[PDB]
């Protein structure tokens, strides 16, 4: 078969056009005025990597947990077009503050049967995912997991249940009503919008065994959201992302080195050394590790009949903490920078295994009920 590559990955692409530069200045100004932040500062929250100390944290406070999807984290902003004050416009924007204008998308207002009324000053936190259906059909979906503002009112200072509560009633409910009767008009939407499937902090097992294997998109871990804390812009020490070791991948520069024998010539059919290199300076690479390859994989690699050396590969750590080939990355000019590699490995060193996480669940459950007393 073909060599595993980035083309195997179902990659969600934002179904919109980049907003013009003059337009984003207005939006950033408009958003900052609404939230009370700095205009060029991303108002979204960022999670911290799940560490060992976070087992105790889950025992002390009420938590929700959801599936962390393979997709794009972006904020959805319902507003009016910066150039056309009478035109309802929806924007998606990521942590790099890149605004995408999405057309033909529409969020109904409750009890308005005219269909002319629309929401403004509404800001959601969610994930853009690509659901795969049989027959090679694709469906873009936006999974809402938090609400920063709804109809001019800032909910950041409220708790999670209230934030998600206002979204469900004011936005999700009318859209559901609308979709039931306007199915034709719904199918033109660039994407569908829904509240994310959530569980109580101790319902981890249910996620692993029932929810995650039934999703129509990919998964790369869990998100733990505290229900006792306000929404925090930037790094939130109470928002935890967990991820198995096998999903903490690194891009390396692969380089093959063949044993130069003293007698005769080189046997190229024999397994060489697989050197993994880290990118530092300009075109300056440094040795970092050897990729472990067994005989069966080496034959498989040769059977690909593609160049192996001098290209970017994504690798993962196995149970023996050996770096293993995952796929080629043709979409990368260079391997990860040493600073990036260090960060990933730190998340692994302070990591918690899936077994330890599960075996700590019942204690987390009983403490949750001792608080409900």
């Amino acid at each position: 078969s073909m060599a595993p590559s980035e083309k195997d990955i179902e990659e969600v692409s934002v179904p919109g056009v980049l907003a013009p530069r003059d337009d984003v200045r207005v939006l950033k100004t408009r958003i900052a005025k609404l939230l009370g932040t700095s205009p060029d500062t991303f108002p979204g929250s960022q999670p911290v990597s799940f560490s060992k100390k976070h087992l105790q944290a889950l025992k002390e406070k009420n938590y929700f947990v959801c599936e962390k999807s393979d997709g794009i984290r972006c904020l959805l902003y319902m507003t009016e077009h910066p150039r056309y004050e009478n035109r309802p416009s929806v924007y998606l924007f990521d942590r790099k503050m890149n605004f995408y204008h999405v057309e033909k998308i529409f969020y109904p207002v409750e009890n308005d049967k005219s269909g002319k009324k629309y929401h403004v000053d509404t800001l959601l936190d969610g994930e853009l995912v690509l659901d795969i259906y049989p027959g090679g059909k694709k469906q873009l979906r936006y999974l809402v997991f938090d609400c920063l503002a709804c109809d001019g009112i800032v909910y950041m200072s409220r708790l999670l249940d209230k934030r998600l509560g206002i979204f469900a009633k004011s936005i999700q409910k009318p859209l559901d009503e609308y979709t039931k009767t306007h199915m034709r008009e719904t199918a033109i939407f660039p994407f569908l919008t829904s509240l994310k499937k959530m569980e109580l902090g101790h319902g981890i097992l249910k996620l692993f065994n029932e929810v995650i294997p039934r999703l129509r998109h990919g998964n790369d871990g869990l998100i733990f959201t505290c229900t006792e804390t306000p929404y925090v812009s930037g790094t939130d020490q109470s928002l935890l992302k967990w991820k198995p070791k096998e999903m903490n991948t690194i891009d390396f520069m692969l380089k093959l080195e063949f044993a130069q024998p003293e007698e005769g010539d080189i046997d190229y059919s024999a397994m060489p050394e697989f050197q993994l290199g880290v990118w530092e300076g300009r075109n300056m690479y440094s040795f970092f590790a050897f990729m472990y390859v067994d005989e069966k994989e080496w034959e498989k690699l040769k059977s690909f009949n593609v160049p192996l050396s001098e290209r970017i590969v994504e690798c993962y750590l196995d149970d023996e903490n050996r770096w293993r080939f995952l796929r080629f990355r043709d979409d990368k000019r260079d391997a990860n920078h040493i600073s990036t590699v260090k960060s990933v490995l730190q998340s692994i060193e302070d990591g918690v295994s899936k077994e330890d996480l599960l075996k700590e669940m019942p204690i987390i459950r009983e403490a949750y009920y001792n608080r409900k007393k």
């Binding site: 998600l164 509560g165 009633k169 109580l200």
Partner: peptide, 8 residues
Amino acid sequence: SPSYSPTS
């Protein structure tokens, strides 16, 4: 005011 709450 509305509130979100799953189980279990």
